[PDB]
Every structure is written in structure tokens, then in C-alpha cells.
Write a protein that binds this ligand. Sequence first.
Ligand SMILES: [Mg+2]
Ligand SMILES: [Mg+2]
Ligand SMILES: [Mg+2]
Ligand SMILES: [Mg+2]
Ligand SMILES: [Mg+2]
Ligand SMILES: [Mg+2]
Ligand SMILES: [Mg+2]
Ligand SMILES: [Mg+2]
Ligand SMILES: [Mg+2]
Ligand SMILES: [Mg+2]
Ligand SMILES: [Mg+2]
Ligand SMILES: [Mg+2]
Ligand SMILES: [Mg+2]
Ligand SMILES: [Mg+2]
Ligand SMILES: [Mg+2]
Ligand SMILES: [Zn+2]
Lengths: 82, 33, 49, 149, 83
Amino acid sequence: PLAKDLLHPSPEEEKRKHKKKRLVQSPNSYFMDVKCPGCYKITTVFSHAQTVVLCVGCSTVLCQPTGGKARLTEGCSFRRKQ
Amino acid sequence: STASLVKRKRKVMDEEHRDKVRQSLQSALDRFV
Amino acid sequence: PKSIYSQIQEQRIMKEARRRKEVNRIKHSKPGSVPLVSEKKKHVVAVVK
Amino acid sequence: GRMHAPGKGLSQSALPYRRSVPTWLKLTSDDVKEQIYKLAKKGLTPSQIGVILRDSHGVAQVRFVTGNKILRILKSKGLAPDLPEDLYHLIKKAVAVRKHLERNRKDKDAKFRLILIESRIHRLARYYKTKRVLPPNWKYESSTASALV
Amino acid sequence: LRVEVDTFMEAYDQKIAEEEAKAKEEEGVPDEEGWVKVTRRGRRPVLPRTEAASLRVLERERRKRSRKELLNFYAWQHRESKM
RNA sequence: GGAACUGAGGCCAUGAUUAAGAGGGACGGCCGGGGGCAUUCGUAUUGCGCCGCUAGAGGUGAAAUUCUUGGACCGGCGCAAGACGGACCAGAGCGAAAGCAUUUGCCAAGAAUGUUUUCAUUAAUCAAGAACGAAAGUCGGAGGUUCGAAGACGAUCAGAUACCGUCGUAGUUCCGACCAUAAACGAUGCCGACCGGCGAUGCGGCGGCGUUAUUCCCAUGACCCGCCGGGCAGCUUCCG
Ligand SMILES: [Mg+2]
Ligand SMILES: [Mg+2]
Ligand SMILES: [Mg+2]
Ligand SMILES: [Mg+2]
Ligand SMILES: [Mg+2]
Ligand SMILES: [Mg+2]
Ligand SMILES: [Mg+2]
Ligand SMILES: [Mg+2]
Ligand SMILES: [Mg+2]
Ligand SMILES: [Mg+2]
Ligand SMILES: [Mg+2]
Ligand SMILES: [Mg+2]
Ligand SMILES: [Mg+2]
Ligand SMILES: [Mg+2]
Ligand SMILES: [Mg+2]
Ligand SMILES: [Zn+2]
């Protein structure tokens, strides 16, 4: 087999492995800022959302939950946080 | 049991068959037409 | 010896396997999206200087 | 693997190494608590409350923000569940299967599934009695289960 | 009559072609401050911004309210119920 | 109106840390000949009615019992009954096993995947004990097309060449009670850890140069490439 250093994995190796099988566990999910269409209020939405997220200003549907990730509505803009 | 032999032979030949097919591939009304 | 000979055959199989998946990646991607690395300076992580 | 099912899976959550609240979070410890009190009065379980805060309010972990777990926060305020959440849901499932089974005598599979559910109830109840969450006379009965939940 | 139809649709196709080329150029491409717009030209399906789509997703959540909003879970839910 | 001292009450709550590539529960979108109830279609077979035509039809190695001029067999149209679910169907999928295949609706359940949700050791193996358990078979009801142990008839050449034909009892079908056995096989206890490569395959998720359709509702897919999990199976192998 290939020779790997167990103490010093490369960045490409750790991002490919399963999240529980890395040297130190780390999630693949993240939080994002979404900007509503029609009113430009900003809402913080989890990437793998399991509930329908409404804009606080106008109660517009911002996302709909799916199996893996929440699909965003047409016309909104988003940014990753942190 | 020789029933598995024909199955395992067919499974391998199918995989080789995938290889060869991969290699083998390598005026206003005008819009409706 | 058979122990050395077996490892030579196995490591040859793995190396050509990685090459096959690499040419597939560059084919089904943007022409400029794949950096090209020399085999010599591939193994150098960093020079602190 | 699973306690009863043959399959073994690896799907779960992976907590981050860093335990600190991110800077962009503008909610305080007190602000999160009043949100928990509001949703509990609406009739939401502690598992569902944590889901809502994660999806909409950007609270990844209530424990890292306030220093206390959701159930511990509710107990201190006085909004404690009558029955433990995992035990409560198992009893609810057994009632639904038993109601279905009384209209279908020929469903052998449902009869088999009912036995497995009741086994998990007995294991869970035995643990809770040792921890003194339940009185040492609590018993699960099929007729009593409907009134229990 | 035939000339006007041909002239009209020739101009219409040219306008349509320009819009597609501009949309392809803008697809992705975070702007200043780093906002990325969500369109149908990506590989992930997106929720349409139509009245029918919003009513469908909200109705699905409303049918689930019975299961997720409980009436006898908490101790207080029993005591003012007995009143 | 201010301050400083001080005194007893009433409710609720009373806990070592973390969050196991241990386990349970919840949540999300999917997925499957998994199960139960109802509904529905398809030829075929059998029986019956009518029409046309006229000596044979059936069966075998050869025949013979049997049916036929009061019309058999064959051709057409229509009606009824009971079973069955071809081709598509794969070493694919589901279930603890036994097992599971026409459309649509309903009821409850489930694996895997996704999760920065929740509890916090709740776990493993197990005499005793309990649920299920192909086919055949027993008891009581309802039906009976096809097939068919038993039985009665007709024959019984080749031959180490060796078990036919016509009719067809119990059964085969359904609803309840029993019975608890199979080459019920990998002829092969369970849980945990460690220990080589290479591709396909089913499901779920993630990323993607390009093709191909497009969304009132219904729906956001089909193909190609890389990666990650748990499955069904393979090709090759070092040490042991
Ligand atoms: Mg899971
Ligand atoms: Mg994709
Ligand atoms: Mg854990
Ligand atoms: Mg389904
Ligand atoms: Mg199904
Ligand atoms: Mg006649
Ligand atoms: Mg006829
Ligand atoms: Mg069919
Ligand atoms: Mg039987
Ligand atoms: Mg029988
Ligand atoms: Mg009988
Ligand atoms: Mg068998
Ligand atoms: Mg055995
Ligand atoms: Mg599957
Ligand atoms: Mg897939
Ligand atoms: Zn808005």
C-alpha cells in the first residue's frame, strides 16, 4: 500500500475522509446569511435545515428542507459565515 | 455448483463489455424543425 | 524474493489506478481548473527559509 | 449495530472541537432562555426546541451559549415533562400499533413489531427506576398506556 | 404579412440570445461583499418564487403540526387540563 | 418624603466532567415483489346458449376404454364460475426466518443516508420463559375451474431401455382452530477490535466540463466524471 504519515495528513486527505474517521472530528455543515427578496433583511440559516425558514420581516419562504441540504428559493443571495 | 460458475463468468464478461463500449465511443417556423 | 516481487506488482497497479482517475478528472472539468505539478517538487511541502 | 435491527450504520452528528460561541451570534444567554420558555409553552419537546434554534436563530449549541442543557433549563423554570421524552415516544408508538392491530387480526408482522417495542419499554423503564426518575411501582400496561400518554 | 412576422421574430431571438449569454456570465461570480445569487442555472434544484410553490410547502408543514405540537407532554399540560 | 439598621413567611429547584467511528429517542427528504384491508384489470381454462359445416375426434411405441349424423372435433358471437398473476424478471430489491410480483386507495411499521437536535451508560451474551415457523396433515364452516394421492376401467412394444391412457375420490382455493416438522445449508454461535489491492452494482448524501428535457397542478429529472457511508455480490492476492 501507499505510505501515509498518520500524524501529518495532508489537507486534501482529511477533507475527503468521513467526518467521524478524521484524526479530530469536524462537521461539514455551516451557517450562512441569506438576503430575502422583496425586503433585504438578512437571516441566519443552517445549511442542512430541517424546517421551513421564513423571513422575519415579511414571512416569505426562504428555504425548503430536503434529504441533505435545504434548497433556497429563487432570487435570494447567500454568504457563508465565520 | 456450476450454477455459480456461469453467474461469475457472466459478471466478469459484463465488466469487460463496459470497457469496449467506453473505447468504442472514443424562418419563423425553423425553430420547430 | 516473492515478498519483494509481490509488492512491486501491487504498487504498480495502484499507481496506474491513480493516473486513470486523474485523467478522468481533468477531462470532465474546466481546462484551467487543474494545477499541474512536477513529480520532483510534488514531495516538497514547504521551504521555511 | 442496532439493538434489534440487523443493520449497522454510522450516521450521526459530529461536534466541533471549538466550544466557544461565534462572534456573529448577537443573542445573549438570557435571550436564548426566553425563546426556550416560549416554545415549550407551545408544546414542543426539548429535541424539537433545539432544532428550531439551530435552523433559524443560529444557535448551534444551547449548552455552549447558556452553560446548561435544554431539559435542565426547563426543569429549573418549572416546565418539566411528566414523562421522559424517549420513554414517552415509545409508549405512543405502542398505542398506535395496538390500535391498528385490533382492527387487523391477520397482521402477523405488526404483532411481531409490537413485541420488539415493548421490550425497549421494559429496558428503558428498568433504567429509569434505578435512577429514581420513575417511582419503584410504575408499570407499563396495555390498557393503562392509553391514559399514560 | 410574412415579412413582418420574420422581422419580429428575428429581433425577438436576438434579444433572447443576449439575455442567456449575460446570465451565463453572471452565474456564480460573488460580487463585492461576497453575495452569491441563487438561480436555476446551477446544478442544485431551487424553489421557484411563485405563489403555488409557497402554498405547497406551507401546507405540508401545516399537516405536520398535529404530530410535533403535543398536548399532554409537559406536567403543566396535565394540571390546568384537570381544571 | 427620604435613607441606614435589621425580623419572620409563601411558591418552584436542588446536579462531578465529557458527549464514545457504544446504545436509545426525535427530526428531514427519499427508498423497497416487507405486512394488513378494500378496489381493479388481463388473457387462458372450464361450462352454457345460438349460428356455419360435415365424419370423424381423442390418445399411444402400437393401441384400446371414451365422445360422435339427436352433429362430436373445428370456425364465429355472447354469458357465467373458480383459479392464476407470463414475457419485462436481474444472482437485482425487501423481511428475524419461513418467505414476498396486475392497477388504484387506505392503515400501521422499517433499513440506510443527512444532522453543530435530545438523553447520558440506558450495554453484550443468555438456561427458564414467550411470539413466528414452507409443504403435507387433523377439526368445524364456504366453495369447487384446473390439477390430482386413492379407486375403477383400457392396455401392457421395445427392454440394463422400467410405470402409459380415460374417468377422476380426499385434497389443491377461502374463513376460523390445531399440528411445529424440511438437504428449514455457507452441510459453518453471537457481540467487539485488528488485519491487502482492483473495479462494478442497489440505496442515500456531496462536488462537477459538458449533453438532454422541462414544470398551473403534478413535478425539479435522464446520461457522464470524482468522492463519502451502510448493503448484495465478484476478480485477484502477502503472511497466517
Ligand atoms: Mg441516523
Ligand atoms: Mg448533482
Ligand atoms: Mg455520540
Ligand atoms: Mg414508500
Ligand atoms: Mg413499500
Ligand atoms: Mg351446432
Ligand atoms: Mg366452440
Ligand atoms: Mg405481470
Ligand atoms: Mg402450511
Ligand atoms: Mg391444506
Ligand atoms: Mg375440510
Ligand atoms: Mg428454502
Ligand atoms: Mg444450520
Ligand atoms: Mg436498496
Ligand atoms: Mg447514488
Ligand atoms: Zn423578507
